[PDB]
mmCIF file of C-alpha atoms and ligand atoms in Angstrom:
data_model
loop_
_atom_site.group_PDB
_atom_site.id
_atom_site.type_symbol
_atom_site.label_atom_id
_atom_site.label_comp_id
_atom_site.label_asym_id
_atom_site.label_seq_id
_atom_site.Cartn_x
_atom_site.Cartn_y
_atom_site.Cartn_z
ATOM 1 C CA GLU A 24 26.984 3.273 -23.056
ATOM 2 C CA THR A 25 28.899 6.455 -21.983
ATOM 3 C CA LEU A 26 25.807 8.694 -22.584
ATOM 4 C CA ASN A 27 23.670 8.723 -19.366
ATOM 5 C CA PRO A 28 25.565 5.741 -17.695
ATOM 6 C CA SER A 29 23.450 6.025 -14.473
ATOM 7 C CA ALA A 30 20.251 5.660 -16.608
ATOM 8 C CA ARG A 31 18.599 8.431 -14.483
ATOM 9 C CA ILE A 32 15.385 10.262 -15.642
ATOM 10 C CA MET A 33 16.393 13.368 -17.622
ATOM 11 C CA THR A 34 14.587 16.717 -17.910
ATOM 12 C CA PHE A 35 14.556 18.785 -21.078
ATOM 13 C CA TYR A 36 13.795 22.502 -21.637
ATOM 14 C CA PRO A 37 13.553 22.955 -25.474
ATOM 15 C CA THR A 38 13.359 26.455 -26.963
ATOM 16 C CA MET A 39 10.454 27.213 -29.347
ATOM 17 C CA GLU A 40 12.783 26.475 -32.356
ATOM 18 C CA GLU A 41 13.838 23.004 -30.995
ATOM 19 C CA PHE A 42 10.241 22.210 -29.897
ATOM 20 C CA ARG A 43 8.682 22.722 -33.390
ATOM 21 C CA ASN A 44 9.905 19.290 -34.734
ATOM 22 C CA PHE A 45 8.710 16.520 -32.375
ATOM 23 C CA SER A 46 10.442 13.601 -34.156
ATOM 24 C CA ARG A 47 13.725 15.548 -34.385
ATOM 25 C CA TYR A 48 13.586 16.452 -30.626
ATOM 26 C CA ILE A 49 12.909 12.788 -29.630
ATOM 27 C CA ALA A 50 16.058 11.865 -31.665
ATOM 28 C CA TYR A 51 17.971 14.674 -29.901
ATOM 29 C CA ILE A 52 16.923 13.535 -26.326
ATOM 30 C CA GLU A 53 18.097 9.971 -27.268
ATOM 31 C CA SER A 54 21.526 11.291 -28.449
ATOM 32 C CA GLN A 55 21.722 12.524 -24.737
ATOM 33 C CA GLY A 56 20.846 9.014 -23.446
ATOM 34 C CA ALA A 57 17.357 9.932 -22.114
ATOM 35 C CA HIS A 58 15.978 6.554 -23.389
ATOM 36 C CA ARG A 59 18.208 4.639 -20.871
ATOM 37 C CA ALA A 60 15.988 5.651 -17.914
ATOM 38 C CA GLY A 61 12.889 4.438 -19.835
ATOM 39 C CA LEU A 62 11.233 7.771 -19.080
ATOM 40 C CA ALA A 63 11.996 11.482 -19.761
ATOM 41 C CA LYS A 64 10.383 14.850 -18.850
ATOM 42 C CA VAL A 65 10.075 17.684 -21.460
ATOM 43 C CA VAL A 66 9.043 21.100 -20.131
ATOM 44 C CA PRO A 67 7.723 23.093 -23.135
ATOM 45 C CA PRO A 68 8.498 26.813 -23.736
ATOM 46 C CA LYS A 69 6.320 29.224 -21.648
ATOM 47 C CA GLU A 70 4.890 30.732 -24.941
ATOM 48 C CA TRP A 71 3.361 27.354 -25.911
ATOM 49 C CA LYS A 72 -0.174 26.430 -24.755
ATOM 50 C CA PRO A 73 -2.312 23.649 -26.415
ATOM 51 C CA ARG A 74 -5.667 25.272 -25.426
ATOM 52 C CA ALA A 75 -6.661 28.881 -24.472
ATOM 53 C CA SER A 76 -8.833 27.656 -21.508
ATOM 54 C CA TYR A 77 -10.339 24.468 -19.996
ATOM 55 C CA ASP A 78 -13.594 26.280 -18.969
ATOM 56 C CA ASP A 79 -15.896 24.578 -21.541
ATOM 57 C CA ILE A 80 -15.422 20.887 -20.634
ATOM 58 C CA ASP A 81 -18.005 20.557 -17.781
ATOM 59 C CA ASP A 82 -20.359 18.459 -20.008
ATOM 60 C CA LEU A 83 -17.599 16.313 -21.533
ATOM 61 C CA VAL A 84 -18.637 12.667 -21.047
ATOM 62 C CA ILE A 85 -16.353 10.052 -19.400
ATOM 63 C CA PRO A 86 -17.998 6.959 -21.011
ATOM 64 C CA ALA A 87 -16.574 4.368 -18.623
ATOM 65 C CA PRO A 88 -15.277 5.639 -15.222
ATOM 66 C CA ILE A 89 -13.553 2.824 -13.332
ATOM 67 C CA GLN A 90 -13.555 2.277 -9.583
ATOM 68 C CA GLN A 91 -10.058 0.883 -8.685
ATOM 69 C CA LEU A 92 -10.268 -1.947 -6.148
ATOM 70 C CA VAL A 93 -6.845 -2.848 -4.779
ATOM 71 C CA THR A 94 -5.956 -6.013 -2.885
ATOM 72 C CA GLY A 95 -2.598 -6.866 -1.295
ATOM 73 C CA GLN A 96 0.049 -6.563 1.443
ATOM 74 C CA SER A 97 3.861 -6.140 1.885
ATOM 75 C CA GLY A 98 4.336 -3.918 -1.248
ATOM 76 C CA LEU A 99 2.552 -6.420 -3.577
ATOM 77 C CA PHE A 100 -0.938 -5.588 -4.876
ATOM 78 C CA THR A 101 -3.501 -6.491 -7.571
ATOM 79 C CA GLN A 102 -5.858 -3.739 -8.874
ATOM 80 C CA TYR A 103 -9.360 -4.753 -10.136
ATOM 81 C CA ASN A 104 -11.547 -2.467 -12.265
ATOM 82 C CA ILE A 105 -15.290 -1.962 -11.756
ATOM 83 C CA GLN A 106 -16.796 -0.100 -14.714
ATOM 84 C CA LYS A 107 -19.309 2.522 -13.562
ATOM 85 C CA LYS A 108 -21.954 4.247 -15.720
ATOM 86 C CA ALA A 109 -21.023 7.320 -17.897
ATOM 87 C CA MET A 110 -20.334 10.511 -15.898
ATOM 88 C CA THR A 111 -19.535 14.139 -16.863
ATOM 89 C CA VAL A 112 -16.318 16.076 -15.979
ATOM 90 C CA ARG A 113 -18.458 18.267 -13.654
ATOM 91 C CA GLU A 114 -19.695 15.175 -11.656
ATOM 92 C CA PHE A 115 -16.240 13.543 -11.603
ATOM 93 C CA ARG A 116 -14.735 16.909 -10.318
ATOM 94 C CA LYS A 117 -17.307 17.219 -7.431
ATOM 95 C CA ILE A 118 -16.492 13.562 -6.362
ATOM 96 C CA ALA A 119 -12.664 14.043 -6.714
ATOM 97 C CA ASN A 120 -12.703 17.264 -4.647
ATOM 98 C CA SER A 121 -15.220 16.065 -1.965
ATOM 99 C CA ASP A 122 -13.978 15.352 1.620
ATOM 100 C CA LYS A 123 -14.216 11.536 1.013
ATOM 101 C CA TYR A 124 -11.946 11.509 -2.043
ATOM 102 C CA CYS A 125 -9.741 14.651 -1.809
ATOM 103 C CA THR A 126 -5.912 14.701 -1.409
ATOM 104 C CA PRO A 127 -4.822 14.346 2.243
ATOM 105 C CA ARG A 128 -2.871 17.150 3.914
ATOM 106 C CA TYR A 129 0.934 16.717 3.645
ATOM 107 C CA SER A 130 4.171 18.778 3.630
ATOM 108 C CA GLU A 131 6.726 17.091 1.254
ATOM 109 C CA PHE A 132 6.042 14.536 -1.598
ATOM 110 C CA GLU A 133 7.759 11.729 0.452
ATOM 111 C CA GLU A 134 4.913 12.071 3.025
ATOM 112 C CA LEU A 135 2.233 11.911 0.260
ATOM 113 C CA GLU A 136 3.994 8.897 -1.379
ATOM 114 C CA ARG A 137 3.925 7.100 2.051
ATOM 115 C CA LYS A 138 0.203 7.971 2.363
ATOM 116 C CA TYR A 139 -0.396 6.400 -1.084
ATOM 117 C CA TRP A 140 1.386 3.069 -0.273
ATOM 118 C CA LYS A 141 -0.258 2.905 3.242
ATOM 119 C CA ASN A 142 -3.800 3.593 1.942
ATOM 120 C CA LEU A 143 -4.135 2.221 -1.672
ATOM 121 C CA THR A 144 -6.308 -0.764 -0.596
ATOM 122 C CA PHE A 145 -8.767 1.534 1.287
ATOM 123 C CA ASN A 146 -11.529 3.910 0.019
ATOM 124 C CA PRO A 147 -11.432 2.783 -3.715
ATOM 125 C CA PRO A 148 -11.199 5.847 -6.029
ATOM 126 C CA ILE A 149 -12.760 6.392 -9.500
ATOM 127 C CA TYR A 150 -10.443 6.857 -12.495
ATOM 128 C CA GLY A 151 -11.967 8.577 -15.527
ATOM 129 C CA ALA A 152 -9.610 6.599 -17.819
ATOM 130 C CA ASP A 153 -9.431 5.841 -21.581
ATOM 131 C CA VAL A 154 -11.620 8.683 -22.787
ATOM 132 C CA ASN A 155 -11.443 8.848 -26.594
ATOM 133 C CA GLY A 156 -10.613 12.458 -27.375
ATOM 134 C CA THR A 157 -8.259 15.457 -27.238
ATOM 135 C CA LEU A 158 -8.106 18.835 -25.491
ATOM 136 C CA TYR A 159 -5.725 20.352 -28.132
ATOM 137 C CA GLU A 160 -7.052 23.181 -30.315
ATOM 138 C CA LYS A 161 -6.974 22.521 -34.126
ATOM 139 C CA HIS A 162 -4.453 25.344 -35.048
ATOM 140 C CA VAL A 163 -1.735 23.861 -32.663
ATOM 141 C CA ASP A 164 0.922 22.147 -34.826
ATOM 142 C CA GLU A 165 3.719 21.550 -32.253
ATOM 143 C CA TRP A 166 3.525 18.300 -30.176
ATOM 144 C CA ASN A 167 -0.162 17.748 -31.007
ATOM 145 C CA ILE A 168 -0.838 14.282 -29.478
ATOM 146 C CA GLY A 169 -3.730 13.913 -31.990
ATOM 147 C CA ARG A 170 -1.283 14.204 -34.990
ATOM 148 C CA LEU A 171 2.391 13.654 -33.982
ATOM 149 C CA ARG A 172 3.617 12.662 -37.509
ATOM 150 C CA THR A 173 5.722 9.573 -36.615
ATOM 151 C CA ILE A 174 6.453 6.350 -38.563
ATOM 152 C CA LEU A 175 3.486 4.792 -36.579
ATOM 153 C CA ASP A 176 1.097 6.461 -39.136
ATOM 154 C CA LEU A 177 1.947 3.531 -41.511
ATOM 155 C CA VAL A 178 -0.554 1.394 -39.482
ATOM 156 C CA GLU A 179 -3.643 3.523 -40.377
ATOM 157 C CA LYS A 180 -2.224 4.829 -43.716
ATOM 158 C CA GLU A 181 -1.181 1.449 -45.214
ATOM 159 C CA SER A 182 -2.759 -1.351 -43.063
ATOM 160 C CA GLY A 183 -5.955 0.649 -42.323
ATOM 161 C CA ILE A 184 -6.069 -0.499 -38.657
ATOM 162 C CA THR A 185 -7.153 1.980 -35.935
ATOM 163 C CA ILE A 186 -6.194 0.950 -32.368
ATOM 164 C CA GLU A 187 -7.954 3.450 -30.003
ATOM 165 C CA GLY A 188 -5.364 5.019 -27.641
ATOM 166 C CA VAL A 189 -2.423 3.616 -29.716
ATOM 167 C CA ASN A 190 -2.805 5.688 -32.946
ATOM 168 C CA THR A 191 -5.574 8.008 -31.496
ATOM 169 C CA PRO A 192 -5.466 10.295 -28.346
ATOM 170 C CA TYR A 193 -6.866 9.239 -24.950
ATOM 171 C CA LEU A 194 -7.872 11.461 -22.038
ATOM 172 C CA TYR A 195 -7.437 10.518 -18.333
ATOM 173 C CA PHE A 196 -9.331 12.283 -15.540
ATOM 174 C CA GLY A 197 -7.606 11.486 -12.254
ATOM 175 C CA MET A 198 -8.336 11.813 -8.557
ATOM 176 C CA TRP A 199 -6.117 11.248 -5.507
ATOM 177 C CA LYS A 200 -4.781 7.653 -5.228
ATOM 178 C CA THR A 201 -5.878 6.622 -8.774
ATOM 179 C CA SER A 202 -3.118 4.411 -10.135
ATOM 180 C CA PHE A 203 -1.531 2.987 -13.267
ATOM 181 C CA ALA A 204 0.114 -0.372 -12.647
ATOM 182 C CA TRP A 205 3.542 -1.657 -13.930
ATOM 183 C CA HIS A 206 3.625 -2.067 -17.750
ATOM 184 C CA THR A 207 5.415 -1.226 -21.031
ATOM 185 C CA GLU A 208 3.348 0.145 -23.950
ATOM 186 C CA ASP A 209 1.340 -2.049 -26.345
ATOM 187 C CA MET A 210 3.880 -3.627 -28.814
ATOM 188 C CA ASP A 211 6.609 -2.023 -26.528
ATOM 189 C CA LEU A 212 5.995 1.326 -28.313
ATOM 190 C CA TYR A 213 6.853 4.825 -27.043
ATOM 191 C CA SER A 214 4.254 7.066 -25.359
ATOM 192 C CA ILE A 215 3.663 10.761 -24.919
ATOM 193 C CA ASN A 216 1.718 12.065 -21.907
ATOM 194 C CA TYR A 217 0.610 15.682 -21.479
ATOM 195 C CA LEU A 218 -0.680 16.933 -18.149
ATOM 196 C CA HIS A 219 -3.368 19.486 -19.197
ATOM 197 C CA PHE A 220 -4.341 20.769 -15.726
ATOM 198 C CA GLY A 221 -4.668 19.988 -12.046
ATOM 199 C CA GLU A 222 -2.679 18.189 -9.411
ATOM 200 C CA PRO A 223 0.580 16.300 -10.201
ATOM 201 C CA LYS A 224 1.082 12.724 -11.457
ATOM 202 C CA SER A 225 4.044 10.737 -9.968
ATOM 203 C CA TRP A 226 5.868 8.108 -11.994
ATOM 204 C CA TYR A 227 8.240 5.184 -11.263
ATOM 205 C CA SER A 228 10.374 3.768 -14.089
ATOM 206 C CA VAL A 229 12.653 0.729 -14.516
ATOM 207 C CA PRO A 230 15.410 1.201 -17.186
ATOM 208 C CA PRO A 231 14.740 -0.966 -20.331
ATOM 209 C CA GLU A 232 18.116 -2.704 -19.683
ATOM 210 C CA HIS A 233 16.726 -3.972 -16.304
ATOM 211 C CA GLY A 234 13.131 -4.631 -17.542
ATOM 212 C CA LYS A 235 13.730 -8.451 -17.679
ATOM 213 C CA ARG A 236 14.739 -8.322 -13.966
ATOM 214 C CA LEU A 237 11.323 -6.780 -13.041
ATOM 215 C CA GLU A 238 9.523 -9.448 -15.169
ATOM 216 C CA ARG A 239 11.437 -12.293 -13.358
ATOM 217 C CA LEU A 240 10.484 -10.668 -10.001
ATOM 218 C CA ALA A 241 6.800 -10.231 -10.966
ATOM 219 C CA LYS A 242 6.662 -13.867 -12.363
ATOM 220 C CA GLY A 243 8.037 -15.159 -9.015
ATOM 221 C CA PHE A 244 5.406 -13.256 -6.916
ATOM 222 C CA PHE A 245 2.367 -14.138 -9.120
ATOM 223 C CA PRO A 246 2.974 -17.738 -10.401
ATOM 224 C CA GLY A 247 -0.701 -18.371 -11.269
ATOM 225 C CA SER A 248 -0.773 -15.211 -13.440
ATOM 226 C CA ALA A 249 2.519 -16.291 -15.166
ATOM 227 C CA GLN A 250 1.063 -19.692 -16.182
ATOM 228 C CA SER A 251 -2.305 -18.255 -17.406
ATOM 229 C CA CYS A 252 -0.510 -15.573 -19.534
ATOM 230 C CA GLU A 253 3.025 -15.205 -21.035
ATOM 231 C CA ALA A 254 2.818 -11.386 -20.602
ATOM 232 C CA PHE A 255 0.452 -10.860 -17.581
ATOM 233 C CA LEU A 256 1.927 -7.362 -16.820
ATOM 234 C CA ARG A 257 0.089 -6.155 -20.029
ATOM 235 C CA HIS A 258 -3.190 -6.738 -18.076
ATOM 236 C CA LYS A 259 -2.129 -3.577 -16.085
ATOM 237 C CA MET A 260 -3.230 -5.055 -12.706
ATOM 238 C CA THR A 261 0.116 -5.479 -10.887
ATOM 239 C CA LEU A 262 1.235 -2.841 -8.333
ATOM 240 C CA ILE A 263 4.739 -3.238 -6.759
ATOM 241 C CA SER A 264 6.092 -0.633 -4.243
ATOM 242 C CA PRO A 265 9.547 1.071 -4.595
ATOM 243 C CA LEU A 266 10.594 -0.595 -1.244
ATOM 244 C CA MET A 267 9.809 -4.033 -2.759
ATOM 245 C CA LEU A 268 11.903 -3.041 -5.886
ATOM 246 C CA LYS A 269 14.788 -1.968 -3.534
ATOM 247 C CA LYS A 270 14.528 -5.257 -1.520
ATOM 248 C CA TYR A 271 15.052 -7.332 -4.685
ATOM 249 C CA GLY A 272 17.713 -5.087 -6.263
ATOM 250 C CA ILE A 273 15.599 -3.829 -9.173
ATOM 251 C CA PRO A 274 17.081 -0.426 -10.256
ATOM 252 C CA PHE A 275 14.433 2.317 -10.680
ATOM 253 C CA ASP A 276 13.911 6.070 -10.542
ATOM 254 C CA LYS A 277 10.995 8.349 -9.593
ATOM 255 C CA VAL A 278 9.752 11.675 -11.022
ATOM 256 C CA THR A 279 6.743 14.006 -10.419
ATOM 257 C CA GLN A 280 5.017 15.456 -13.516
ATOM 258 C CA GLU A 281 3.286 18.825 -13.094
ATOM 259 C CA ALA A 282 0.570 20.609 -15.074
ATOM 260 C CA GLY A 283 1.927 21.783 -18.421
ATOM 261 C CA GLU A 284 4.707 19.119 -18.638
ATOM 262 C CA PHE A 285 5.247 16.187 -21.001
ATOM 263 C CA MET A 286 6.374 12.647 -20.111
ATOM 264 C CA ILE A 287 7.995 10.398 -22.729
ATOM 265 C CA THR A 288 8.115 6.618 -22.216
ATOM 266 C CA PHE A 289 10.642 4.611 -24.227
ATOM 267 C CA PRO A 290 10.340 1.157 -25.850
ATOM 268 C CA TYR A 291 10.405 -1.593 -23.150
ATOM 269 C CA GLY A 292 10.447 1.066 -20.385
ATOM 270 C CA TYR A 293 8.378 -0.333 -17.501
ATOM 271 C CA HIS A 294 6.399 2.340 -15.648
ATOM 272 C CA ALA A 295 3.834 2.732 -12.820
ATOM 273 C CA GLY A 296 2.455 5.637 -10.812
ATOM 274 C CA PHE A 297 -0.374 7.577 -9.241
ATOM 275 C CA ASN A 298 -2.354 10.876 -9.301
ATOM 276 C CA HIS A 299 -2.014 13.380 -6.465
ATOM 277 C CA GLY A 300 -5.550 14.757 -7.052
ATOM 278 C CA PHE A 301 -8.050 16.034 -9.655
ATOM 279 C CA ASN A 302 -6.273 16.351 -12.988
ATOM 280 C CA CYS A 303 -6.412 15.668 -16.749
ATOM 281 C CA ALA A 304 -3.706 14.048 -18.968
ATOM 282 C CA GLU A 305 -3.716 13.307 -22.723
ATOM 283 C CA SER A 306 -1.861 10.287 -24.110
ATOM 284 C CA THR A 307 -0.982 8.433 -27.354
ATOM 285 C CA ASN A 308 1.707 6.035 -28.683
ATOM 286 C CA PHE A 309 4.324 6.841 -31.291
ATOM 287 C CA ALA A 310 7.375 5.267 -32.942
ATOM 288 C CA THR A 311 10.893 5.989 -34.301
ATOM 289 C CA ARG A 312 13.082 3.694 -36.528
ATOM 290 C CA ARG A 313 14.527 2.157 -33.286
ATOM 291 C CA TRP A 314 11.119 0.831 -32.144
ATOM 292 C CA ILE A 315 10.750 -1.421 -35.279
ATOM 293 C CA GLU A 316 13.058 -4.066 -33.662
ATOM 294 C CA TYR A 317 11.291 -3.877 -30.237
ATOM 295 C CA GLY A 318 7.992 -4.305 -32.167
ATOM 296 C CA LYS A 319 9.214 -7.554 -33.899
ATOM 297 C CA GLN A 320 10.394 -9.017 -30.545
ATOM 298 C CA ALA A 321 7.477 -7.970 -28.272
ATOM 299 C CA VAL A 322 6.068 -10.715 -25.936
ATOM 300 C CA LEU A 323 2.298 -10.200 -26.197
ATOM 301 C CA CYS A 324 -0.732 -11.152 -24.064
ATOM 302 C CA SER A 325 -1.933 -14.599 -25.195
ATOM 303 C CA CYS A 326 -4.908 -15.054 -22.786
ATOM 304 C CA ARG A 327 -7.047 -12.230 -24.354
ATOM 305 C CA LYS A 328 -8.556 -12.032 -27.910
ATOM 306 C CA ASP A 329 -9.068 -8.193 -28.048
ATOM 307 C CA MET A 330 -5.309 -7.367 -27.283
ATOM 308 C CA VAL A 331 -3.289 -4.803 -29.319
ATOM 309 C CA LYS A 332 -1.270 -6.515 -32.100
ATOM 310 C CA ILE A 333 0.460 -4.600 -34.938
ATOM 311 C CA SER A 334 1.532 -6.496 -38.136
ATOM 312 C CA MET A 335 5.267 -5.732 -38.367
ATOM 313 C CA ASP A 336 5.675 -6.759 -42.085
ATOM 314 C CA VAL A 337 5.057 -3.168 -43.428
ATOM 315 C CA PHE A 338 7.775 -1.722 -41.025
ATOM 316 C CA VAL A 339 10.271 -4.467 -42.018
ATOM 317 C CA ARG A 340 9.563 -4.004 -45.786
ATOM 318 C CA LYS A 341 10.007 -0.170 -45.680
ATOM 319 C CA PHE A 342 12.797 0.317 -43.065
ATOM 320 C CA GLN A 343 14.590 -3.138 -43.010
ATOM 321 C CA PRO A 344 14.379 -4.418 -46.722
ATOM 322 C CA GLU A 345 17.587 -6.534 -46.337
ATOM 323 C CA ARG A 346 16.303 -8.401 -43.199
ATOM 324 C CA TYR A 347 12.668 -9.069 -44.417
ATOM 325 C CA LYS A 348 13.484 -12.518 -45.956
ATOM 326 C CA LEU A 349 15.699 -13.614 -42.990
ATOM 327 C CA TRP A 350 13.012 -12.424 -40.424
ATOM 328 C CA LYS A 351 10.162 -14.204 -42.347
ATOM 329 C CA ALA A 352 12.208 -17.493 -42.365
ATOM 330 C CA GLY A 353 12.739 -17.034 -38.598
ATOM 331 C CA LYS A 354 16.534 -16.633 -38.931
ATOM 332 C CA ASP A 355 16.781 -12.933 -37.720
ATOM 333 C CA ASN A 356 18.768 -13.451 -34.482
ATOM 334 C CA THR A 357 19.041 -9.611 -33.820
ATOM 335 C CA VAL A 358 19.897 -8.869 -30.151
ATOM 336 C CA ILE A 359 18.568 -5.390 -29.085
ATOM 337 C CA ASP A 360 21.197 -3.099 -27.433
ATOM 338 C CA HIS A 361 18.998 -0.914 -25.152
ATOM 339 C CA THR A 362 21.756 1.787 -24.703
ATOM 340 C CA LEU A 363 21.823 2.599 -28.461
ATOM 341 C CA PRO A 364 20.028 5.796 -29.717
ATOM 342 C CA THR A 365 17.614 5.876 -32.690
ATOM 343 C CA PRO A 366 19.335 6.069 -36.189
ATOM 344 C CA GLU A 367 17.821 9.630 -36.582
ATOM 345 C CA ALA A 368 20.010 10.777 -33.568
ATOM 346 C CA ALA A 369 23.138 10.769 -35.853
ATOM 347 C CA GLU A 370 22.978 14.531 -36.784
ATOM 348 C CA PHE A 371 23.498 15.152 -32.995
ATOM 349 C CA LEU A 372 26.470 12.638 -32.885
HETATM 350 O O1 FQ5 B 411 -1.689 8.075 -16.040
HETATM 351 C C1 FQ5 B 411 -1.934 7.028 -16.610
HETATM 352 N N1 FQ5 B 411 -3.132 6.417 -16.452
HETATM 353 C C2 FQ5 B 411 -3.479 5.289 -17.114
HETATM 354 N N2 FQ5 B 411 -2.723 4.666 -17.982
HETATM 355 C C3 FQ5 B 411 -1.463 5.205 -18.201
HETATM 356 C C4 FQ5 B 411 -0.510 4.635 -19.085
HETATM 357 N N3 FQ5 B 411 -0.924 3.666 -20.022
HETATM 358 C C5 FQ5 B 411 -2.166 3.140 -20.170
HETATM 359 C C6 FQ5 B 411 -2.133 2.322 -21.265
HETATM 360 C C7 FQ5 B 411 -3.282 1.532 -21.849
HETATM 361 C C8 FQ5 B 411 -0.794 2.408 -21.710
HETATM 362 N N4 FQ5 B 411 -0.067 3.217 -20.967
HETATM 363 N N5 FQ5 B 411 0.738 5.057 -19.249
HETATM 364 C C9 FQ5 B 411 1.102 6.153 -18.564
HETATM 365 C C10 FQ5 B 411 0.269 6.847 -17.718
HETATM 366 C C11 FQ5 B 411 -1.025 6.365 -17.535
HETATM 367 CL CL1 CL B 412 -11.682 22.010 -14.772
HETATM 368 ZN ZN1 ZN B 413 1.848 3.822 -20.221
HETATM 369 ZN ZN1 ZN B 414 -2.951 -12.126 -20.932
#
């Protein structure tokens, strides 16, 4: 409550020694109140590099590039995907850098951000999203998105369920104006995002303590979507501008991620954003002991059969043995305090 009261996005510069233990550092950033913004930036030490070069990925296949069709006005938009046939990085790069799709000329980010909100419904771009894979070299043990060693490993280790992009890494090849709509992670988990190379990625975040305020706003503007699904923002179609957020008093913050930087999203941290140009990011989900409760109380998409659903039993039996019986009977009336750090943050408090 007194740690990060403003709930502003925090930036961290770990040393090589701090950086070596991912789970310990995530507990440390939470002891500093980073989780209150719903998003944090971690700039790794200059000596750390996940790959020697990105010169050998020309023939890497993007199995399902998606053309992003956006419809809307007055800061409220719906984004529709059109799956295109498989393309290579080389082909995607030529398209992204061509006169038709390249980044417009601008001076400051505020000018580029205006250009994005003025032109998102025009000239639909192609997003090389959800590519199963990693760009990390095998020998890299620190912050390896392909093997983070978090309590989320219980899903594949005990339950045997593999949710692509949740417990496995995903690659994202971006181009100017490609977007990611307002959402929290599947099961309201955490996420890690590494920007491998290229142009920046800008983010907007709503603090988890104000997340319900954004949902009430979004439900009011899309009533049809609210009736059809009890968690329509998980469809990842809804784009809302910062000016619209300001108009309806939704607190938020913005940050620009650059090549070689990490972004951490926190349980029930709503986020949206866009790519400045040709780039590549790697992403996966992870958990701490704090997520377990968010996981049990997550409002999931009901309208779709293929949606990501984790059985919480195993997490409640291992980390909450006392509450298992009460939770199974439907008597666990636990009210999540969003300002509270993860139990592992104690050694820093
Ligand atoms: O840059 C992005 N592009 C696309 N998706 C992103 C995303 N999430 C996507 C899923 C699924 C879950 N999260 N979170 C963050 C960033 C991005
Ligand atoms: Cl490249
Ligand atoms: Zn996300
Ligand atoms: Zn749904």
